[PDB]
Amino acid sequence: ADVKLHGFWASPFSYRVIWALKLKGVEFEYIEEDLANKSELLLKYNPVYKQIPVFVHGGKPIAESLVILEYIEETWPENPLLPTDPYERAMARFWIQYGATKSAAFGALFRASGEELEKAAKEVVEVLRVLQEQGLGDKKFFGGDSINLVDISYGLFVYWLAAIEDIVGVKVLEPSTLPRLHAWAQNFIEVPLIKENHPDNDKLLLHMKGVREKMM
Amino acid sequence: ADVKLHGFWASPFSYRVIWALKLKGVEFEYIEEDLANKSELLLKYNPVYKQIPVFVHGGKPIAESLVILEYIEETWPENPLLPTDPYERAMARFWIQYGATKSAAFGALFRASGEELEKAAKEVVEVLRVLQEQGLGDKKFFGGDSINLVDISYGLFVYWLAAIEDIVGVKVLEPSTLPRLHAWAQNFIEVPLIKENHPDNDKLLLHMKGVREKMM
Ligand SMILES: N[C@@H](CCC(=O)N[C@@H](CSO)C(=O)NCC(=O)O)C(=O)O
Ligand SMILES: N[C@@H](CCC(=O)N[C@@H](CSO)C(=O)NCC(=O)O)C(=O)O
């Protein structure tokens, strides 16, 4: 396979690329990186950040999941994951950037000690409320009737929410508080592409529990 | 004028939009916002962040300078500010995102107290070295022989460097340490479009000095 993807089994960032490639029907070779012993190709291809994912097409590398997603959308334009209208595309990019900026609040809640856990959860709920009210609205998905790059970027929120609930013991996405966003999260998880491509849940929660245990 | 731009006289973010519009030859109405008494249109158009710039086209608003820049490039494709090849476009977006991520180091250096000022300056120099070596290379501009959206995004670095040097008293862009990036910064400042469109330097340094004086 011409296309290569360097990833990590538990990474939402490399899963974003797997979803986009599988949606487009692009064959690819997947390379699992040991983050404690990074491959020579990983360090050569991504000297700036030394992170996965690293997507390679025709021997040329691309780092940063959002940048890779836009390259895939431009290179394989069939089965579009962005709208064609520039204004609608700007709204999609606006919400993808909002997700990237606000993703730090989820890590803060995940590592928050007993005190200030209530405050960290409060800030996450507000982020989700704005996302629901101004981003999603009454649509089934951020992409309308089917998922698009906005829904793919928000898989990271679902990953964080499910882990925070099962490990931290706090639920920041309550059906009675955010009915539309909660319905979205359930619908997203049930999309066959998503159902078929995600880290083993038991293995993922165990891994994340050990990561949280480090920060005391 | 159909196109409207809500900005702030001392903002590099609204200057990014002015540069792109003037390069494209798009007429626009400029609205100066008082950040202490935001207009009804500013709060209506940008409820998520309540910030300038806010670009309006056909009565429809767009917030976030990088998102607005891509909308302008797609809407007025003549005089291109991004390459057409998807791989080259991905490298442009990669370096624009690197600039956004690393811009926080400049604010850190600007507000750094006497102790840890040396450390903040060290981290900025490393950011600039990677930008020079891996981003700019031997090109005159990030856009090659003429400025593109990458150069426009890096006007923010020039704004910070000039202010840090004249206010903090530390020079993080030395010609003998970063010759290519220093030559780039001088060439960028001398582009007639840039020379003709920037905050009054005396007025800007005075304003920024007062902003730094607040954080003690
Ligand atoms: N902005 C990037 C983030 C990638 C990332 O965090 N990758 C992590 C593992 S995923 O939890 C990574 O590769 N870290 C390297 C390390 O742990 O040393 C993107 O969106 O592609
Ligand atoms: N991510 C945005 C940043 C805009 C911004 O910081 N704007 C500031 C003033 S510029 O120094 C702003 O509008 N702040 C509002 C306030 O001070 O309340 C962009 O790139 O458009």
Mutation probe of ligand 1 site: the residue of A19, A45, A52 with most atoms within 8 A of C-beta: A52
Reported structure resolution in angstroms: 1.6
- The Cα B126–Cα B123 span in angstroms is 5
- The Cα B208–Cα B200 span in angstroms is 12
Distance from CA of A10 to the nearest CA of B (A): 23
Task: Name the residue with the closest Cα to ligand 2, atom 6.
Answer: B51
Sole residue written with tokens 């809407």: B75
The DSSP secondary-structure symbol of B134 reads I
The ligand whose atoms approach the alpha carbon of B53 most closely is: 2
Polymer length in residues for chain B: 216
For the CA of B66, the closest atom of ligand 2 is 20
Do A53 and A14 touch, CB atoms closer than 8 A? Answer: yes
Do B71 and A87 touch, CB atoms closer than 8 A? Answer: yes
Distance from CA of A206 to the nearest CA of B (A): 31
Residue type, A190: E
Q: Is B92 on the interface with A (CB under 8 A)?
A: no
- The Cα B91–Cα A71 span in angstroms is 10
- The Cα A55–Cα A77 span in angstroms is 17
Report phi then psi at B55, rounded to 5.
-100, 140
Q: Which residues of B touch A68 (CB under 8 A)?
A: 90
Sheet of strand B60-63, all strands in order from the earlier edge strand to the far edge: B28-32, B3-7, B54-57, B60-63
Long-range contacts of B200-209 (CB under 8 A, 24+ apart): B201/B162, B203/B10, B204/B10, B204/B163, B205/B163, B205/B166, B205/B167, B207/B10, B208/B10, B208/B163, B208/B167, B209/B167
Burial of A67 (0-12, 13-18, 19+ CB in 10 A): buried
Among A92, A149, A134, A100, which residue's Cα sits nearest to residue B71?
Answer: A92
CA within 13 Å, CB half, B211: 14
Sole residue written with tokens 């999609």: A92
**B-chain residue closest to A128, CA distance:** B48
Among A140, A150, A149, A106, which residue's Cα sits nearest to residue A126?
Answer: A106
Gyration radius of chain A's alpha carbons:
17
Q: Is A111 on the interface with B (CB under 8 A)?
A: no
Q: Residue B189: count other Cβ atoms within 10 Å of its Cβ.
A: 13
Domain residue ranges of chain A, discontinuous segments joined by + = 1-84, 85-216
Judge if the beta carbon of residue A13 lies within 6 A of ligand 1: yes
Can you count the helices (H) and strands (E) in chain A? 11, 4
Compute the Cα dihedral for A36, A37, A42, A48 and give only its sign: positive
